Symmetry: C4
Subunit: 30 residues, 4 copies
């Protein structure tokens, strides 16, 4: 159902933002 | 087809959770 | 709604490409 | 259209596999 699909798309976007949070790792190079 | 989209999005979310598993790399700091 | 799903999937793919940008980190090795 | 959505889902899954390629980075810890 479209609501469930939307909700999962949002959860994926939110995880990608937290991953891009974890990647400031890049401390090692600057 | 709609359930196939939802299942692929669950697989994508689960792989992102495993990546976000791997990234605690950030131990180093 | 269907185009909104396709647009969000493009944003997801673009953010993954930026992550896969960040991960060349792998310079270290 | 459903084909275009499917194709993008596959491209995302393929990028996630390459990222999880780049993360064997985890050389630093083992």
């Amino acid at each position: 159902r479209m609501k469930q699909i939307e909700d999962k798309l949002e959860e994926i976007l939110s995880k990608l933002y937290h991953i891009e949070x974890e990647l400031x790792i890049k401390x090692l190079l600057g």
